[PDB]
Amino acid sequence: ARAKAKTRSSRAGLQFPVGRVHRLLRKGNYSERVGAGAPVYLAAVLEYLTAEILELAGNAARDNKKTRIIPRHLQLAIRNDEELNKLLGRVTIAQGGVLPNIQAVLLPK
Amino acid sequence: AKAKTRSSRAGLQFPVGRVHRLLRKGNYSERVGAGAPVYLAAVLEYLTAEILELAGNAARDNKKTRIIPRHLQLAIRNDEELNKLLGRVTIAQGGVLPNIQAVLLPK
Amino acid sequence: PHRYRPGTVALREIRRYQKSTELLIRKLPFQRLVREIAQDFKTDLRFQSSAVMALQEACEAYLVGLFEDTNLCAIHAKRVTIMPKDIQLARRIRGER
Amino acid sequence: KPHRYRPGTVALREIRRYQKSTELLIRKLPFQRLVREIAQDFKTDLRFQSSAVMALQEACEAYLVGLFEDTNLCAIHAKRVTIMPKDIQLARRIRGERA
Amino acid sequence: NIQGITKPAIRRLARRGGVKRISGLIYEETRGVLKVFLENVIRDAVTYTEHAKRKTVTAMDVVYALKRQGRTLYGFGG
Amino acid sequence: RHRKVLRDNIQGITKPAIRRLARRGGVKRISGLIYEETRGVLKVFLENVIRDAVTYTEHAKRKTVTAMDVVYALKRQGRTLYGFGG
Amino acid sequence: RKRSRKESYSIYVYKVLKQVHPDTGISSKAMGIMNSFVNDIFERIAGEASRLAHYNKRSTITSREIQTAVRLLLPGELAKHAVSEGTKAVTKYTSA
Amino acid sequence: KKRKRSRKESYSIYVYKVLKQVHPDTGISSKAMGIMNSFVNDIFERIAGEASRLAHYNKRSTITSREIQTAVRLLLPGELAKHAVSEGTKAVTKYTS
DNA sequence: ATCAATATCCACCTGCAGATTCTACCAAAGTGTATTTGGAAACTGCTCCATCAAAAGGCATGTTCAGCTGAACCAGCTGAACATGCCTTTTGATGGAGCAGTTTCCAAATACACTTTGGTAGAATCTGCAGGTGGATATTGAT
DNA sequence: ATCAATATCCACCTGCAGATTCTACCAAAAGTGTATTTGGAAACTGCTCCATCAAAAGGCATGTTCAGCTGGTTCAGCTGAACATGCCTTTTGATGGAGCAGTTTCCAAATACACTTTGGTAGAATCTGCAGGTGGATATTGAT
Ligand SMILES: [Cl-]
Ligand SMILES: [Cl-]
Ligand SMILES: [Cl-]
Ligand SMILES: [Cl-]
Ligand SMILES: [Mn+2]
Ligand SMILES: [Mn+2]
Ligand SMILES: [Mn+2]
Ligand SMILES: [Mn+2]
Ligand SMILES: [Mn+2]
Ligand SMILES: [Mn+2]
Ligand SMILES: [Mn+2]
Ligand SMILES: [Mn+2]
Ligand SMILES: [Mn+2]
Ligand SMILES: [Mn+2]
Ligand SMILES: [Mn+2]
Ligand SMILES: [Mn+2]
Ligand SMILES: [Mn+2]
Ligand SMILES: [Mn+2]
Ligand SMILES: [Mn+2]
């Protein structure tokens, strides 16, 4: 008789799905074989980046006094963060708009 | 029966078996159809022919019987579509096209 | 009667639209355009509504970014007015033309 | 007399001459030393195939020439014929190399 | 239909882009450029559609086409 | 043994070399402040390519940077280079 | 008949959102952005890992290929913290 | 005392064959040939990658001459796409019979 | 409108470093046989897409003028051209560091059978938002 | 720089409709247990080709003169901003039905392995453009 099933994600201390990520790795034709630690490492990295973006975007959403993050807040957070901006430099967030910016020379006086 | 290469059956100069092997071992999909390497081999042969055509011309314009990377460059860059296809590519030892902005010429 | 000095309402408009995220082209002209262009490639096509929305999101974000660059090119030539030549300089440096 | 060309004549002559040739324009040894210094700041005791160094030098010089064409276009845009740091910066900014 | 992208629309796009003053020739230039962009994306989205043997262009066709053009879009299924 | 300490080598990229590069680029007149900008820009470019090449080298558990490491680095930086393998 | 069964990362993104900002929720369109994001970084890393293995004439993608791929793909501090989180997760998993 | 050596493949022979077809009189330097090998590998990987993504989007596990054809349409500009589809379709129909 | 003073151009040679041809192994392609299976092809649900007609509401249009751009003029000064003096890079051998070729044995992978969780879809919440206001902030013009 | 005088923007409320969260089933899928296989790490070690050095070979650094480029200044033509109104296009919101998409089913076509040639590669052995050296012809530039 089998023991009580423990998800790999829980074994890894993660919220993101290690099992799914492993499946996706196996079925995406990236290689013949996928090592046991690879989906754990990748799931952890995905979770980290998701957390970073949600950290900054939550700050953005409640500094403008909302309790729900909307795409605008994601844009504000990505673009105001140099490294995220770099990572997503060739990406458009739908309904995100732009950062407030007027070239100084365009101002009066 | 007497062995006939796939390239010969398809009428190609490029190696169909090789292209098949490279498709199977490159992890592009679980399976590769029998027709995929023929088509791809033919397309590679074609683009090679197009580029060697234009560069042979560049070479005979420079009065050379042998193609050098400069001729490949001249051929790619003077041709709108190859230039577009290789728009993000550097030809080593290829140089650039003669071009001087008009405003820089003497009055 | 009241009149704002030329340029005041412009700056106000910059602030207004940089503060918002709504699409700036009217839906229907845009869609009719999408369908014309497509029909030059493939006929008796239909479009999901989301497909058209994605094309418009893409178009507007591209045009907004291109206008930012164009404006940098105008500022560069010591003007504050963008011109076709600015759009072309931006596009040629971007490797688009 | 003694002979002297007007400023710009030899410059245009040099453009024709270097656009006509394909040889690398940076001297080999200095470029090598730069490559090894940078690399050594990433990882120590590295060696290089000479092909590796040549490949870096072809890539660098091609990049710098292309950036100089764009820079020149920005100068010409501002009604000048002299390239300046502000031109290189406008070129890199539009290229999305800096932002 | 390209004339349907009106002077005020293009003006708003330019305003979000931070542009303060606009030459009158901009609008036609802008229309040309938008048309080239759309042709480029739509040609690929439609290629994807015919490949899937459909007659309806789906959001994914547009998203994949955008990803090929180096214009990745988040929020429509990819 | 070991070689002598490499310092300040970006300065070995001389004013005449930068001038020739600019000439191939079609540049007629050159401000005196260009030479430092160019050096700066060059170093960024190199730092960026060499970093990736070395990552590939380290991954392959080698001590020698190969032409392929450089070519893969270039290809991922969107600067594909023809003529050195692959 | 039944429509398809669609997977997405929504539930996990939500869990992370709650860890970091217990007070804050998220719009469905925002959730779509975040989904697109996870899929995109996923594919970038896995693709880099795939090429790494092919260059080195290897048929297995291990946590090593993933790590090198992370170093290649992420800028600076983001790369450092991702490599740290990754190694941490693998270690915890291994011991457990 | 026992001895060691190895074998590397390239497209040289085939490029040379094509060169003789289009320019019987002309030869080619080894560096030029290196450029051409890079070219064949580059286009190869681009087409195969486009075909891979294509097959994946459409839930298909086999890459056929059809995926290759679509990938070729996606990657090549205009007339090149036309002539490549011609050469490919021709090669395949010839092969099949 | 001419001459010098230079620079580039453009054949012509000749030898050898680099390209082509030649052979001989063996690395892989082709053939043959047997076994699994992916994905058209066909047959219908049911999503949403195209259409259409009566709502709103933004744009087209034409006129006044603020001020931006582009021209014209000019002086300060910066960067090109060049002659000089010699330090740095290129070139050629060559031992040996370290890739790369081989072999082999496990840690780590797959293969197969069997048995909680993510997705889904109404119900039950709750928060932005649409709409309205008035105070806040900003701009314009006359002293 | 101040005051008025407007004009527009932006917090601040409010109620409640719609979007989010909440609940509770249920197949699909992730996990577990056991059995085998196997890709590749590690260990040796042949054999390329890298680092090194010092004599050659050859540009770079340096300072001075001044041509002409840049940037400042002024100013009027005229272009593009602002603005006010009713017509015409866009928006909104029901419908019928086109065609994605869900299910299922079998065969053409895929993979896998063995067996046997055969095209491709790696030097070896020739072969031959063209690099590099020169010199004379023609072109171009800049000073009178
Ligand atoms: Cl692993
Ligand atoms: Cl096929
Ligand atoms: Cl213009
Ligand atoms: Cl400057
Ligand atoms: Mn250092
Ligand atoms: Mn089946
Ligand atoms: Mn030796
Ligand atoms: Mn050793
Ligand atoms: Mn078994
Ligand atoms: Mn659950
Ligand atoms: Mn409101
Ligand atoms: Mn009231
Ligand atoms: Mn066995
Ligand atoms: Mn083995
Ligand atoms: Mn003067
Ligand atoms: Mn006036
Ligand atoms: Mn029907
Ligand atoms: Mn034979
Ligand atoms: Mn010569």
Side-chain angles (χ1 to χ4, degrees):
Chain A
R2 41 188 57 186
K4 203 188 165 207
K6 315 249 165 231
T7 69
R8 291 191 262 174
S9 292
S10 40
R11 293 187 161 92
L14 294 177
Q15 310 293 317
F16 264 46
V18 175
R20 183 171 289 189
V21 165
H22 196 161
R23 190 205 343 129
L24 294 171
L25 276 169
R26 292 186 338 258
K27 298 198 195 149
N29 293 123
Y30 301 103
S31 50
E32 185 60 33
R33 310 170 131 207
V34 191
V40 179
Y41 203 111
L42 176 53
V45 170
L46 296 171
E47 183 181 303
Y48 166 69
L49 304 164
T50 299
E52 189 70 50
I53 286 181
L54 289 172
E55 180 63 28
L56 298 175
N59 297 343
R62 70 178 176 275
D63 281 348
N64 180 37
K65 299 319 212 336
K66 285 227 211 303
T67 57
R68 255 195 274 161
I69 297 170
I70 54 168
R72 172 65 169 176
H73 302 138
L74 292 170
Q75 172 83 340
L76 292 173
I78 305 318
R79 302 313 167 190
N80 277 308
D81 186 281
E82 203 172 348
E83 290 188 338
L84 287 182
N85 174 67
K86 172 87 153 200
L87 170 69
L88 306 173
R90 303 291 318 176
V91 161
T92 299
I93 293 141
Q95 281 304 302
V98 308
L99 291 187
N101 185 32
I102 305 184
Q103 296 296 309
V105 79
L106 297 182
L107 301 170
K109 172 195 320 164
Chain B
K2 206 184 168 277
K4 214 180 189 293
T5 73
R6 291 195 264 175
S7 290
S8 322
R9 294 187 163 91
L12 296 174
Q13 312 294 313
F14 266 43
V16 171
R18 184 170 287 188
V19 167
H20 196 165
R21 191 196 80 219
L22 298 172
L23 276 171
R24 285 182 329 256
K25 299 200 194 151
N27 285 307
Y28 300 103
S29 53
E30 197 63 32
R31 308 169 129 209
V32 187
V38 173
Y39 204 116
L40 176 54
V43 166
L44 300 174
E45 188 183 304
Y46 169 64
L47 299 163
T48 300
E50 182 68 48
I51 205 166
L52 287 173
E53 181 63 31
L54 296 173
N57 296 343
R60 181 158 50 200
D61 288 350
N62 167 4
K63 299 172 194 173
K64 294 284 180 43
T65 51
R66 190 192 291 147
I67 291 174
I68 62 168
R70 171 64 170 177
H71 304 140
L72 291 169
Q73 249 293 93
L74 297 174
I76 306 317
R77 302 313 169 188
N78 283 312
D79 190 80
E80 311 169 27
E81 287 185 335
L82 284 181
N83 176 65
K84 176 83 154 72
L85 170 70
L86 307 174
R88 285 280 131 189
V89 168
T90 293
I91 308 301
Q93 279 305 301
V96 305
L97 292 185
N99 184 32
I100 306 185
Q101 301 300 309
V103 220
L104 300 182
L105 301 172
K107 175 196 139 225
Chain C
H2 186 69
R3 278 207 104 195
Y4 286 102
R5 293 159 68 182
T8 298
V9 180
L11 289 175
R12 188 197 304 154
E13 270 173 22
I14 290 167
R15 293 178 222 272
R16 172 193 320 168
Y17 294 114
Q18 288 190 345
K19 182 192 315 149
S20 61
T21 70
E22 90 274 25
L23 293 185
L24 296 176
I25 307 189
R26 285 173 317 169
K27 233 149 284 224
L28 185 65
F30 181 79
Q31 185 179 100
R32 198 164 347 98
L33 174 69
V34 175
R35 293 177 190 264
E36 174 196 310
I37 289 157
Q39 169 147 57
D40 272 294
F41 294 114
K42 160 92 188 225
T43 337
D44 192 7
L45 278 162
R46 292 165 71 99
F47 277 78
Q48 302 186 336
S49 170
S50 55
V52 166
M53 289 303 99
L55 285 164
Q56 205 186 327
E57 291 282 354
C59 287
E60 294 202 11
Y62 167 79
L63 286 179
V64 171
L66 179 57
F67 274 135
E68 306 165 353
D69 289 350
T70 293
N71 185 330
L72 286 177
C73 294
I75 305 297
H76 191 70
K78 310 279 193 72
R79 295 175 278 104
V80 298
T81 304
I82 61 170
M83 305 179 179
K85 76 188 57 170
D86 296 314
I87 293 183
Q88 297 153 6
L89 182 59
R91 286 193 86 233
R92 173 92 208 80
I93 298 317
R94 286 173 161 214
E96 289 179 27
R97 71 170 72 207
Chain D
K1 326 300 188 96
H3 185 69
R4 211 191 169 64
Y5 288 108
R6 292 162 67 184
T9 296
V10 184
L12 287 171
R13 189 193 302 156
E14 271 166 20
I15 291 169
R16 297 177 223 272
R17 170 195 174 180
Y18 292 122
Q19 288 187 344
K20 181 192 315 150
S21 59
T22 71
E23 88 272 24
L24 289 177
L25 292 174
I26 306 186
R27 284 171 317 169
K28 258 65 168 321
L29 187 66
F31 185 79
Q32 289 227 24
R33 276 199 257 96
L34 176 68
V35 171
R36 291 175 190 261
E37 175 191 312
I38 287 155
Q40 172 152 259
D41 282 338
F42 290 113
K43 167 95 191 69
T44 53
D45 309 327
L46 282 162
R47 291 169 134 226
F48 278 77
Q49 302 182 335
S50 62
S51 308
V53 175
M54 293 307 294
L56 288 163
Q57 208 185 329
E58 294 282 352
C60 288
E61 295 203 16
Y63 169 79
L64 288 180
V65 170
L67 180 58
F68 273 129
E69 304 161 350
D70 288 349
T71 302
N72 204 32
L73 286 177
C74 294
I76 291 171
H77 192 68
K79 311 280 194 73
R80 295 177 277 104
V81 303
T82 303
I83 59 169
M84 305 178 177
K86 77 187 59 169
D87 295 313
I88 292 183
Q89 295 152 6
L90 182 58
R92 289 203 337 119
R93 167 90 158 272
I94 294 179
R95 287 173 160 217
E97 286 179 25
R98 73 170 74 208
Chain E
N1 285 298
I2 191 64
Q3 297 301 328
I5 290 72
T6 66
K7 161 164 168 168
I10 297 174
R11 177 179 290 268
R12 301 189 283 267
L13 293 167
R15 291 279 190 266
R16 186 170 278 168
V19 172
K20 179 189 199 180
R21 209 161 180 275
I22 299 166
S23 151
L25 291 168
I26 278 303
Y27 309 115
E28 278 300 287
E29 187 77 21
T30 294
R31 291 195 186 95
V33 152
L34 180 168
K35 180 158 174 280
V36 159
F37 179 90
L38 271 181
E39 278 163 353
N40 280 329
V41 181
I42 289 175
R43 191 192 28 253
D44 284 357
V46 161
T47 301
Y48 282 115
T49 296
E50 289 181 16
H51 186 82
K53 288 146 156 173
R54 291 185 260 97
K55 332 190 41 188
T56 305
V57 180
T58 72
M60 293 322 287
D61 300 338
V62 174
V63 178
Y64 297 144
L66 288 171
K67 203 189 193 71
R68 299 201 63 252
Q69 309 290 328
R71 312 276 334 162
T72 302
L73 179 62
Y74 282 0
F76 285 88
Chain F
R1 294 180 183 175
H2 52 286
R3 63 186 182 278
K4 155 180 147 173
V5 196
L6 305 168
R7 313 140 60 200
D8 206 31
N9 285 296
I10 190 65
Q11 295 301 327
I13 309 281
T14 60
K15 161 165 168 168
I18 298 174
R19 181 177 292 269
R20 300 186 282 267
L21 290 165
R23 292 281 187 267
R24 184 168 280 167
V27 170
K28 179 188 200 180
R29 207 160 179 273
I30 298 166
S31 150
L33 291 168
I34 282 305
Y35 308 110
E36 273 302 290
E37 276 287 288
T38 298
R39 291 193 185 96
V41 156
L42 173 48
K43 189 156 180 279
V44 162
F45 181 90
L46 267 182
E47 280 162 359
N48 282 334
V49 176
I50 289 177
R51 187 199 274 105
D52 285 359
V54 169
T55 298
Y56 285 113
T57 304
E58 286 166 7
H59 185 80
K61 289 149 156 69
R62 290 185 262 99
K63 322 188 37 190
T64 307
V65 182
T66 69
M68 289 321 288
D69 299 338
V70 173
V71 182
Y72 298 144
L74 290 168
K75 202 192 278 298
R76 57 178 323 279
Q77 308 285 324
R79 313 274 335 163
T80 304
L81 179 62
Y82 285 2
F84 285 90
Chain G
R1 282 154 260 183
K2 260 171 260 282
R3 311 229 313 177
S4 278
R5 199 199 185 240
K6 311 153 316 212
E7 290 170 351
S8 94
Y9 288 100
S10 295
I11 267 167
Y12 310 107
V13 168
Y14 205 85
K15 288 190 191 128
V16 169
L17 173 55
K18 287 315 153 173
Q19 282 184 321
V20 153
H21 276 231
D23 54 322
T24 304
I26 181 173
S27 84
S28 61
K29 263 155 202 164
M31 182 55 86
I33 310 304
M34 291 304 303
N35 258 291
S36 286
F37 172 69
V38 176
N39 291 311
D40 176 20
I41 307 301
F42 181 101
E43 170 53 47
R44 289 197 227 181
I45 292 167
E48 193 59 60
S50 175
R51 280 165 237 126
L52 265 165
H54 285 135
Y55 299 154
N56 278 282
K57 286 183 110 176
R58 281 194 203 322
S59 50
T60 312
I61 283 174
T62 69
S63 59
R64 203 168 170 268
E65 277 67 31
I66 299 291
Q67 170 163 288
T68 298
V70 159
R71 285 195 197 289
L72 291 171
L73 276 154
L74 300 190
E77 291 301 298
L78 236 45
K80 299 183 170 177
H81 293 150
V83 173
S84 181
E85 296 268 286
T87 54
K88 184 199 304 175
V90 170
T91 291
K92 194 179 196 333
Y93 172 81
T94 295
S95 59
Chain H
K1 155 181 214 170
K2 193 161 194 176
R3 299 156 346 183
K4 326 239 228 196
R5 348 197 68 252
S6 176
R7 196 198 182 250
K8 310 156 54 187
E9 292 173 352
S10 94
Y11 287 94
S12 294
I13 267 167
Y14 313 104
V15 162
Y16 209 86
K17 285 191 188 129
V18 173
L19 175 56
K20 286 313 152 171
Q21 284 182 320
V22 306
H23 285 297
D25 60 323
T26 298
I28 185 172
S29 84
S30 62
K31 270 155 205 275
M33 186 57 86
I35 303 301
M36 291 302 302
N37 260 291
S38 284
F39 173 68
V40 177
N41 288 309
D42 178 23
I43 301 301
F44 183 103
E45 179 53 45
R46 290 197 229 176
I47 289 165
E50 194 61 62
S52 178
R53 282 166 238 130
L54 195 58
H56 185 72
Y57 299 157
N58 283 284
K59 271 66 181 174
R60 286 192 213 324
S61 52
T62 173
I63 284 173
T64 68
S65 59
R66 205 165 168 269
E67 278 68 34
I68 303 294
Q69 168 163 287
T70 297
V72 168
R73 285 198 198 292
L74 292 169
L75 274 151
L76 299 195
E79 295 304 298
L80 278 179
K82 213 193 82 198
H83 300 152
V85 173
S86 274
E87 298 266 284
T89 301
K90 182 196 128 196
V92 168
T93 52
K94 190 181 193 334
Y95 177 82
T96 297
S97 60

